[PDB]
Design a protein around this ligand. Structure first.
Ligand SMILES: [Mg+2]
Ligand SMILES: [Mg+2]
Ligand SMILES: [Mg+2]
Ligand SMILES: [Mg+2]
Ligand SMILES: [Mg+2]
Ligand SMILES: [Mg+2]
Ligand SMILES: [Mg+2]
Ligand SMILES: [Mg+2]
Ligand SMILES: [Mg+2]
Ligand SMILES: [Mg+2]
Ligand SMILES: [Mg+2]
Ligand SMILES: [Mg+2]
Ligand SMILES: [Mg+2]
Ligand SMILES: [Mg+2]
Ligand SMILES: [Mg+2]
Ligand SMILES: [Mg+2]
Ligand SMILES: [Mg+2]
Ligand SMILES: [Mg+2]
Ligand SMILES: [Mg+2]
Ligand SMILES: [Mg+2]
Ligand SMILES: [Mg+2]
Ligand SMILES: [Mg+2]
Ligand SMILES: [Mg+2]
Ligand SMILES: [Mg+2]
Ligand SMILES: [Mg+2]
Ligand SMILES: [Mg+2]
Ligand SMILES: [Mg+2]
Ligand SMILES: [Mg+2]
Ligand SMILES: [Mg+2]
Ligand SMILES: [Mg+2]
Ligand SMILES: [Mg+2]
Ligand SMILES: [Mg+2]
Ligand SMILES: [Mg+2]
Ligand SMILES: [Mg+2]
Ligand SMILES: [Mg+2]
Ligand SMILES: [Mg+2]
Ligand SMILES: [Mg+2]
Ligand SMILES: [Mg+2]
Ligand SMILES: [Mg+2]
Ligand SMILES: [Mg+2]
Ligand SMILES: [Mg+2]
Ligand SMILES: [Mg+2]
Ligand SMILES: [Mg+2]
Ligand SMILES: [Mg+2]
Ligand SMILES: [Mg+2]
Ligand SMILES: [Mg+2]
Ligand SMILES: [Mg+2]
Ligand SMILES: [Mg+2]
Ligand SMILES: [Mg+2]
Ligand SMILES: [Mg+2]
Ligand SMILES: [Mg+2]
Ligand SMILES: [Mg+2]
Ligand SMILES: [Mg+2]
Ligand SMILES: [Mg+2]
Ligand SMILES: [Mg+2]
Ligand SMILES: [Mg+2]
Ligand SMILES: [Mg+2]
Ligand SMILES: [Mg+2]
Ligand SMILES: [Mg+2]
Ligand SMILES: [Mg+2]
Ligand SMILES: [Mg+2]
Ligand SMILES: [Mg+2]
Ligand SMILES: [Mg+2]
Lengths: 76, 181, 141, 45, 66, 111
RNA sequence: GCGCUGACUGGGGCCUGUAGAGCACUGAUAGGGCUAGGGGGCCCACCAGCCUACCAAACCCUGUCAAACUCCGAAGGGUCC
RNA sequence: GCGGUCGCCUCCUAAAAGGUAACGGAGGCGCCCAAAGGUCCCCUCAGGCGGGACGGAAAUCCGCCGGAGAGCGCAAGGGUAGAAGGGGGCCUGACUGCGAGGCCUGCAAGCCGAGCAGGGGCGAAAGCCGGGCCUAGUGAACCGGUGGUCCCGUGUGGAAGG
RNA sequence: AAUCCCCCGUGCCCAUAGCGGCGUGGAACCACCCGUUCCCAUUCCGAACACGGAAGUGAAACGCGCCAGCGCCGAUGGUACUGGGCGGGCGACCGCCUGGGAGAGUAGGUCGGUGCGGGGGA
RNA sequence: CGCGGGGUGGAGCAGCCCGGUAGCUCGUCGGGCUCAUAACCCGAAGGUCGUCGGUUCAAAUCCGGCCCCCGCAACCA
RNA sequence: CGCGGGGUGGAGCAGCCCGGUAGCUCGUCGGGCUCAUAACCCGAAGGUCGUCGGUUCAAAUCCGGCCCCCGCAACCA
């Protein structure tokens, strides 16, 4: 057989769901492209990884044509 | 210089005879000239830029504008050509400087074409613009025959505000364009 | 016999046959049809034997339709071997047929003729079948 | 081509990497030392 | 236009089978063109000089009377 | 032909601005006049207005701009507003757009 | 040692792309239509050139298939309160 | 046994979180780029039709139509023109000293990262910059080489060697 | 300020706001326009960008209307599938109960809605 | 269906690594020397690279499938 | 990485010493002997003499930096 290979599962996906309490640092989404875009108080690292910029809670936003967004609405 | 015989002839001759012929309600609706683009397809200069600058030298002499040097969009083996390399020369002349150029094209150049019984009455691209191809750069008055090293023509693209070329035809006609009927 | 040229992938899983005919499904070209009562893999060589049986019993005119197509690659080891080390090998193609599907279907022939042909044609198939005419219902489009 | 470019006194050796035969010159560029701050930095060894 | 890198472009003269073309406006004022066919010489002002159509007609008349 | 160098360049420069979080000093300039608007996004609300067509002034539109520039400061700085970003939209930071910005002095700024 | 936080359950938010279906993409695909060019069969050998009883692109209908196709998309499942 | 395989990335298998096996179905990595890096400013494709000397299916040009089917150094996927793509100007943050908090996770590793300080780059500024659209381009420890630097220097100053 | 009409900004919803046809608007705004001295410009071009202006035009653009040919949205029924619970067939598969319940298609719907701020009106 | 090497003018061989142009001997054709043929001398013609697809700007060349050729293997049982 | 040599024209290759001919063969062309081609004879082609900088009036020479091919010799966690 010429096959037999594969790579390590990269455990990608959302790490904090809407209405979850996070903290400045907490990475909120692990993804390949820009499947989710950084919203309010949400940074995104060189591997497109979204994280809380401040403490607070997590909320999602589907801006249709404009894509989907993860916001960290404060409370801190 | 904002005089020019043809620029004059357009307003005080062509423009009126066009209105009573098509019946334009507005002032702008009547076809204006704009933009005359001259483009030398010069593969002749694949691996030698030395020959590409002599052409530009020539093109600016007849137009009054230094042309821009187009470059190959993609690599295309068969006839050399990779993604780079200067593969053409092009200048876009507009109002005024276009007028003085278009005037000598009618009153000197075309007249100096070996043969010539008129320009092609089908080169209108449908949406009212006209294109014509010349076969040598000696038909222009500025050229001395003793500055040439080899013959290279060019493409001329004249663009009009006229929505149809049925009208675009009249404009060019009345301007003094020698059509083969 | 009858295989689909140019394929993105040769050798494909096998999946199940729990379906019930995606559709289909209601006759749409001829005057009469052969409908599948049971699910099965119909082999290109089974289709070709069903087609021929008809064009043959039709003097030569005739006007089949088939409507099912062998696009699924059927593999099979070289026998006398053991499991492991690659997969099947591809020894033909099949068409997936769940109940409801209309296979074949003929037109431009008498009834006592078309119905006799479809019966013959049906004996060449590994499943149970049914002959139909085509009424309003069929005009589902 | 593994590369280790340095400063211009007390050495330093904050190593980088130039792959080829071009850049093939002195292969130098402005960088910052752990000591004072921001100096020339040249390439060697 | 950008400064330098340019031809001057200046009101000019011209010559032909005609007389004069004041219009011009081009580098190298005063030019002698072989034949400006705009003045009226050549094709336009349909001269049709050295007229033709001998062909049939020619062998026709040296034939009707030979 | 969907979207244009205009509409594009407009978003491009304006999208960046809206990330930094500050209040937006949006500048719309027309052939005759030049207007200025301090907007707060997320509240979708304008705070301080300052036009030239609203101050009925004229005479050299590069000099008018600066006036409506200083005009925006005064009105605004009196509302607490000090620090802001400054749009600029489709217009290169130049001429009368640059002028109005240079006029926005006497009020928070950094520009 | 801490001690009501547990499995499970109710309500609420968010995550998903399977079952099913679909053909909008990637490909596969039956019939018919209309037409690039060729099989041709040929007039020429100067334009040419007529016809399609084999193709066959696209395009249009009527029909369908797909683990590595998806315009769609349940039930469920995950997680936080 | 013979043959094949052995680490890393992509896709499916995988049953809509994560994960998941087989000598299950298919591909790819062991590099590369001083610009293919940072920043500021501009620019928008592929195709299709019509038009235009040498130009031909396709070189360069003009017109309309063209939301992305183009491009993004190479596999695949995800992503993307409201740029991550194309062009230019300056520049080297392919920084030093750190690091809240998390992703992942048996260990050891691998990954993302705000912010502070030093000294800088581009920018009017807001600001961005601790390499590259991203996910492969990799090797614990031991033993040594090389350049520094304080540190130890077998009675003491050195030196040897660390 | 109230209410309202038109226009310029700027948001949000993210095609029911879109394509295309037709019709409208220049007092005011806007655009085109008029020039290229000056700032600044286009690998060539004052096309773009940019400045200084305003005679002219709503032709282009944009704004506002109308039209369902296309695009987009789209029920209600009814099915497919399926939590959970039960049966049946050698199987390949099928049926029942109880909860959830699409996709396609049909009827239809739509050529926008609205926030704040300006300028002009009533 | 295990492993390895191949397939290129009419014959037999190169060229394939590493891309971009196909070379050698013989033969074939035309002309010469000879009374004549061969030898000998002067000229010329002739290959899409088994095949379908893929990669790249470009494929005899790199990659994959299929059809043939040669060689090796098929052991404990 | 350590030690030693040098690339001269289309090829190897002498001139490398006490700084001074930038040579010889085969291949191809011209010309004659040959019934012939080769042999064989006459003449002729091509060197900034690996890189740059130096010490002398120069230099292929000597030094030095430099670059790979070849040459030599160890080591490899
Ligand atoms: Mg596996
Ligand atoms: Mg995986
Ligand atoms: Mg959703
Ligand atoms: Mg159906
Ligand atoms: Mg370092
Ligand atoms: Mg409790
Ligand atoms: Mg639980
Ligand atoms: Mg619950
Ligand atoms: Mg979906
Ligand atoms: Mg399915
Ligand atoms: Mg399809
Ligand atoms: Mg297709
Ligand atoms: Mg068909
Ligand atoms: Mg599926
Ligand atoms: Mg997929
Ligand atoms: Mg839907
Ligand atoms: Mg739950
Ligand atoms: Mg829940
Ligand atoms: Mg073995
Ligand atoms: Mg999963
Ligand atoms: Mg095009
Ligand atoms: Mg064309
Ligand atoms: Mg054409
Ligand atoms: Mg793409
Ligand atoms: Mg790719
Ligand atoms: Mg992709
Ligand atoms: Mg993609
Ligand atoms: Mg760039
Ligand atoms: Mg740059
Ligand atoms: Mg940590
Ligand atoms: Mg790593
Ligand atoms: Mg990378
Ligand atoms: Mg050990
Ligand atoms: Mg040591
Ligand atoms: Mg050590
Ligand atoms: Mg001491
Ligand atoms: Mg002692
Ligand atoms: Mg001591
Ligand atoms: Mg040591
Ligand atoms: Mg030491
Ligand atoms: Mg508005
Ligand atoms: Mg939609
Ligand atoms: Mg419309
Ligand atoms: Mg009107
Ligand atoms: Mg309108
Ligand atoms: Mg008026
Ligand atoms: Mg007026
Ligand atoms: Mg209008
Ligand atoms: Mg308007
Ligand atoms: Mg529907
Ligand atoms: Mg329903
Ligand atoms: Mg529905
Ligand atoms: Mg309506
Ligand atoms: Mg008002
Ligand atoms: Mg051989
Ligand atoms: Mg052979
Ligand atoms: Mg070989
Ligand atoms: Mg011979
Ligand atoms: Mg012979
Ligand atoms: Mg092959
Ligand atoms: Mg490519
Ligand atoms: Mg091929
Ligand atoms: Mg034994």
């Amino acid at each position: 057989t010429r096959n037999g290979r594969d790579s390590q599962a990269k455990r990608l996906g959302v790490k904090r769901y809407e209405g979850q309490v996070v903290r400045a640092g907490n990475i909120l989404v692990r993804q390949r492209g820009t499947r989710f875009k950084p919203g309010k108080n949400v940074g995104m690292g060189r591997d497109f990884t979204l994280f809380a910029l401040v403490d607070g809670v997590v909320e999602f936003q589907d801006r249709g044509r404009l894509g989907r967004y993860v916001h960290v609405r404060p409370l801190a | 210089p904002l005089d020019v015989a043809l620029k004059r002839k357009y307003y005080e001759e062509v423009r009126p005879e066009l209105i009573r012929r098509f019946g334009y309600q507005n002032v702008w609706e009547v076809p204006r000239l704009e933009k005359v683009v001259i483009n030398q397809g010069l593969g002749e200069a694949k691996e030698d830029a030395r020959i590409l600058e002599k052409a530009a030298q020539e093109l600016a002499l007849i137009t009054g504008q230094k042309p821009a040097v187009t470059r190959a969009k993609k690599s295309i083996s068969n006839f050399k050509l990779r993604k780079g390399m200067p593969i053409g020369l092009r200048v876009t002349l507009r109002r005024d400087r276009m007028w003085i150029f278009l005037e000598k094209l009618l009153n000197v150049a075309l007249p100096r074409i070996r043969d010539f019984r008129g320009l092609n009455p089908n080169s209108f691209d449908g949406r009212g613009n006209y294109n014509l191809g010349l076969r040598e750069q000696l038909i222009f008055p500025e050229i001395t025959y003793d500055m040439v090293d080899a013959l290279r023509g060019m493409d001329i693209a004249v663009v009009t505000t006229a929505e149809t070329d049925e009208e675009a035809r009249a404009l060019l006609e009345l301007l003094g364009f020698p059509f083969r009927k | 016999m009858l295989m689909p040229r140019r394929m993105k992938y040769r050798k494909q899983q096998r999946g199940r046959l729990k379906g019930a005919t995606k559709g289909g499904d209601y006759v749409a070209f001829g005057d009469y049809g052969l409908v599948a009562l049971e699910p099965a893999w119909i082999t290109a060589q089974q289709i070709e034997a069903a087609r021929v049986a008809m064009v043959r019993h039709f003097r030569r005119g005739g006007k089949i339709f088939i409507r099912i197509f062998p696009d699924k690659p059927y593999t099979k080891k070289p026998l006398e071997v053991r499991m492991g080390k690659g997969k099947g090998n591809v020894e033909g193609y099949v068409a997936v047929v769940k109940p409801g599907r209309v296979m074949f279907e003929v037109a431009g022939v008498t009834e006592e003729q078309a119905m006799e042909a479809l019966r013959i044609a049906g004996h060449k198939l590994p499943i149970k079948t049914k002959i139909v005419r085509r009424d309003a219902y069929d005009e589902a489009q | 081509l593994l590369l280790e470019c340095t400063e211009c006194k007390r050495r330093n050796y904050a190593t980088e990497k130039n792959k080829r035969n071009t850049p093939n010159k002195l292969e130098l560029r402005k960088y910052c030392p752990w000591c004072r701050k921001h100096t020339v930095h040249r390439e060697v060894k | 236009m950008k400064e330098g890198i340019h031809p001057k472009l200046v009101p000019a003269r011209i010559i032909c089978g005609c007389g004069n073309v004041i219009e011009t406006y081009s580098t190298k004022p005063e030019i002698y063109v072989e034949v400006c066919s705009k003045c009226h010489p050549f094709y336009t002002g349909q001269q049709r000089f050295v007229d033709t159509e001998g062909r049939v007609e020619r062998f026709q008349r040296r034939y009707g009377d030979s | 032909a969907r979207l244009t160098a205009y509409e594009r360049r407009k978003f491009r420069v304006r999208n960046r601005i809206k990330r930094t979080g500050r209040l937006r000093l949006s500048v719309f300039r027309s052939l005759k006049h030049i207007y200025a608007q301090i907007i707060d996004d997320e509240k979708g609300v304008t705070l301080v207005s300052a036009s030239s067509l609203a101050l009925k002034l004229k005479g050299n539109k590069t000099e008018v701009a600066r006036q409506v520039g200083r005009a925006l400061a005064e009105k605004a700085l009196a509302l607490g507003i000090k620090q802001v970003a400054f749009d600029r939209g489709p217009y290169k930071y130049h001429g009368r757009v640059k002028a109005l910005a240079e006029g926005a002095r006497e009020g928070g700024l950094e520009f």
